[PDB]
Amino acid sequence: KLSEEQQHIIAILLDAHHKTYDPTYADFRDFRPPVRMPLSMLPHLADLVSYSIQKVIGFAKMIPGFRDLTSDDQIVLLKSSAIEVIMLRSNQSFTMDDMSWDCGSQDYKYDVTDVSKAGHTLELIEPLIKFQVGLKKLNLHEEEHVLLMAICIVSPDRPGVQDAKLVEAIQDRLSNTLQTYIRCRHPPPGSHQLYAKMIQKLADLRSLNEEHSKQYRSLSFQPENSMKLTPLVLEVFGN
Amino acid sequence: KNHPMLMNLLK
Numbered sequence: 001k002l003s004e005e006q007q008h009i010i011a012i013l014l015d016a017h018h019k020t021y022d023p024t025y026a027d028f029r030d031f032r033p034p035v036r037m038p039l040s041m042l043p044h045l046a047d048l049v050s051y052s053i054q055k056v057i058g059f060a061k062m063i064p065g066f067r068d069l070t071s072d073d074q075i076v077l078l079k080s081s082a083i084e085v086i087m088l089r090s091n092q093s094f095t096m097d098d099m100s101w102d103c104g105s106q107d108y109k110y111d112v113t114d115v116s117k118a119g120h121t122l123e124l125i126e127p128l129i130k131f132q133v134g135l136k137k138l139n140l141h142e143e144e145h146v147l148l149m150a151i152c153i154v155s156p157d158r159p160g161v162q163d164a165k166l167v168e169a170i171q172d173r174l175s176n177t178l179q180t181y182i183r184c185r186h187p188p189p190g191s192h193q194l195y196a197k198m199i200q201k202l203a204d205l206r207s208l209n210e211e212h213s214k215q216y217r218s219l220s221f222q223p224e225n226s227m228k229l230t231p232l233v234l235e236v237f238g239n
Numbered sequence: 240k241n242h243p244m245l246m247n248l249l250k
């Protein structure tokens with residue numbers, strides 16, 4: 001079934017995720033307050049994204065094999081995947097009850113209008129919501145969720161990757177763990193075409209990444225909006 | 240490039 005190395009990888013990723021994702025969202029109180037009356041939600045959501053990039057980095061450093069990469073490739077992988085992993089990890093707070101990201105209180109409950117109040121349009125937000133729904137619908141085990149984030153981060157085809165054979169090798173070990181996990185631990189019918197549907201989510205994330213990058217570039221070009229960002233967001237996403 | 244913050248967080 002699952003090898004000991006495969007069981008090891010899952011236990012580490014589970015722990016890595018628990019150490020970087022607080023399901024009580026207690027730190028949200030440190031963010032600039034949400035304003036729902038412009039781009040009124042930009043300070044709050046920029047802080048949320050900035051915080052989330054830090055946590056995504058803390059998760060990534062714990063992925064078995066990620067440490068063996070050069071710092072340059074570590075950098076390229078995190079820079080290109082950061083928004084995608086934020087999209088993936090946000091599925092935990094996302095609720096199909098009202099199509100929103102519910103982080104524990106009405107202040108920290110984010111809907112379509114809040115995201116648009118951060119400078120984004122339906123060109124991003126509609127496919128984003130549709131992503132979140134299709135992802136929710138997979139009913140992933142936490143083990144599959146954390147494997148999916150890790151696979152997303154160690155993607156050998158990201159532009160600027162130097163040692164791609166190594167990135168592919170690290171990813172393959174994660175991919176094989178996920179396939180084996182689905183076969184051994186995920187009961188049918190839930191498991192039906194589950195790996196192929198998870199991989200399709202990774203494809204959906206490329207389009208979302210591209211559209212986010214387009215809108216972010218337009219947003220951040222205005223010095224008055226880029227003023228509202230954080231230094232980390234500027235470094236990771238641009239300008 | 241230049242990513243001192245990302246670099247710092249990466250250890």
Ligand SMILES: C=C1[C@H](O)CC(=C/C=C2\CCC[C@]3(C)[C@@H]([C@@H](C)CCCC(C)(C)O)CC[C@@H]23)C[C@H]1O
Nearest residue numbers: 045049052086087089090093101110115118212216
């Ligand atoms: C801790 C978390 C996640 O990391 C992030 C959370 C929600 C995710 C959301 C709701 C707000 C808007 C987000 C961050 C989207 C983002 C495209 C907004 C970009 C904003 C900017 C200005 C950086 O471009 C993607 C996922 C979206 C809540 C909680 O689950």
